[PDB]
Design goal:
The complex is a heterotrimer. In chain A, 0% of the residues lie in helices and 47% in strands. By secondary structure, chain A is mainly beta. Chain A has two domains: 3-125, Immunoglobulins (Immunoglobulin-like); 133-223, Immunoglobulin-like (Sandwich). By secondary structure, chain B is mostly beta strands. Chain B has a single domain (6-123, 161-193), classed as 2-Layer Sandwich (Alpha-Beta Plaits), CATH 3.30.70.1840. Chain B has helices spanning 6-10, 85-89; strands at residues 22-26, 29-30, 44-48, 62-71, 99-105, 120-122, 141-142, 156-157, 160-162, 175-184, 192-193. In chain B, the strands form four sheets. Chain B has a five-stranded antiparallel β-sheet with strand order 1-4-10-5-3. A two-stranded parallel sheet of chain B has the order 2-11. The longest helix of chain B is centred in the N-terminal third of the chain and has 5 residues, at 6-10. In chain C, 4% of the residues lie in helices and 45% in strands. Chain C is mainly beta. In chain C, a hairpin with a 6-residue loop joins β3 (34-39) and β4 (46-49). Classes of the chains: A mainly beta, B mainly beta, C mainly beta. Chains in contact: A-B, A-C, B-C. Chains A and C meet through β5, β10, β12, β13 and β17 of A and β7, β8, α1, β11 and β15 of C. A molecule of 2 linked components (NAG-FUC) is lined by residues 11, 13, 38 of chain B. The PDB classes it as immune system. The entry lists the keywords Severe acute respiratory syndrome coronavirus 2, Spike protein, Receptor binding domain, immune system. The assembly is trimeric. Crystal structure of SARS-CoV-2 ConSp RBD in complex with neutralizing antibody CC25.4 Fab.
Chain lengths: 228, 197, 217
Amino acid sequence: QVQLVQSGAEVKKPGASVKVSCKASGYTFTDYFLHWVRQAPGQGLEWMGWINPDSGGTNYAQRFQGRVTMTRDTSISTAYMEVSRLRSDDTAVYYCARDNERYQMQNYYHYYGMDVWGQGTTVTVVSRRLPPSVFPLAPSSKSTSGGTAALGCLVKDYFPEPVTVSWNSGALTSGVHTFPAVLQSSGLYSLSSVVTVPSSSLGTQTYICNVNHKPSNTKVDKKVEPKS
Amino acid sequence: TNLCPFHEVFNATTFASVYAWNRKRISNCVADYSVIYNFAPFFAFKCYGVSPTKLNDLCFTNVYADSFVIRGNEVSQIAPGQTGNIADYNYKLPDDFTGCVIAWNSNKLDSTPSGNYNYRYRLFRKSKLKPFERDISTEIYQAGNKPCNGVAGPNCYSPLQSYGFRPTYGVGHQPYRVVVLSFELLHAPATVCGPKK
Amino acid sequence: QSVLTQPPSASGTPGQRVTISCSGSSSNIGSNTVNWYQQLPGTAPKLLIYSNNQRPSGVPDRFSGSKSGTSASLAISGLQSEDEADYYCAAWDDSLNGYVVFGGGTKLTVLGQPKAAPSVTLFPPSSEELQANKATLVCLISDFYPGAVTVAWKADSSPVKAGVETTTPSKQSNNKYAASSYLSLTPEQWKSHRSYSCQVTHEGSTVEKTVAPTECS
Ligand SMILES: *[C@@H]1O[C@H](CO[C@@H]2O[C@@H](C)[C@@H](O)[C@@H](O)[C@@H]2O)[C@@H](O)[C@H](O)[C@H]1NC(C)=O
């Protein structure tokens, strides 16, 4: 399985450093150059540089020459990308992509494309991390037709993104609709998750939304009780 | 201790076309270039940027073997500072080339009485190739201002052409198997040395 | 440093042929090859074209690449709903020490979906939230197409102005759009108005749900 698997998400303060990993498998690690491409949220792709894992030679983009260091560890077939003096402008998804031309010569390099891509590593540069306040959105007393009720879960005033919401520790997935968050004028985020359930189950089934905000290391379980 | 698999490159059953030349990186082995001399008299054994008497007494970071098949009258193009359809549009060597070019006749292997078809070469290109560049693009060449819309025609020529190697050709038009040994030096420990170390 | 210029958006109905241009300079497209990438939402880019017109193994033949001068073009014939994504061009630029230049990207929209009216659900402030001297109204809009709605809140027919926060439309898993709006209120304002409405206007029509502040309810 020709594959590039990267390290997990990172949250850092402005001025700090981050070191992202990119492990290669399914091919000879030194046969192909490795590129680093980042993508700001809602923005396009930005090239950061390549590294030759056979020799360690690099070619940084001029914008990142000085703050970015690419290294290799052929022992574990892992490429590293380290960014120093992190700015808020650096908040983005960082990809490692394989150069698609085998057996390149470093002093006669030719770029033809990037065939294998990693899943990306999210780096968020924020000064503070605030946990979310989770409130239940109880189902309405009026039982509409079709025998369906809307149970909700309000995740309010958290920063930064993201939060994950499941229902009943993952047992309930049908009819679950987690809405994208809103960016308030306060700078905090708030979203809601809603599950559509049969009205007859409101007296026989428990419903608990599981909210996890990894940027603050908080896992909150809240039961949405049929309550008017 | 291990010997470099130079014989695998020279003894391939079928070689690649020049427009899509092959490349193998030779690394972590002892480079005894005597193994290739099992391949008959060579039509050309020219080295550049290196002393030919030192080929078995040198260490390099890596060695690269580029192989393809051209006509006989085109072997002279596989050299620094050369022009022609092969050097301009198919395989270009740099001026500071450090390596050797090795060519031998392959009429008995790469030619059929009906005419070999797979061995092809690029005939048109908007610009000359950069050193060690490879162009496998198969777009119709627009010679004029009228677009070609993906079909050959007036001022719209297919970029690739076959040699049509037949055994009853002159030696200038017969197929020749070429191997370009490139000697690479980088700021990194050398992995390929000669038998004399 | 350099910029490859792509059209910001491009559209086409299923079965048609769409083209996406890529304008560069002499040191990038005019000198090197052009490769193309497709990026689905929440997905890493996928190589579609390389060496100007070559397709990787597994890329459908309905994708076509071309290069001419300092410009390039991607052609998606036989358009399908799965082709709705962002598309990027890229090429090496010989300027300075050399660098890969990505285009700004082009968002492809496969049209033809029937109109869908917005489904609106409105939630009153929580009992547990009201105990914290805060009140929030949650209006949730889902299963509508095309993705363009305007949200208007009302407090006993009086148009409430400030305190409203609405998201931009976003695709669902069923190719329909979703949005949400939040109204911030002080529990005194929540116990000062007799009803609150969330009006969602979509393609002329308006859908409205209404909550009523009632104690112990
Ligand atoms: C070179 O490789 C040879 C393999 O070629 C195979 O055998 C010939 C007779 C044809 O049928 C060809 O199509 C096959 O692929 C080896 O037999 C040979 O030993 C190798 N060369 C040397 C010097 O040993």
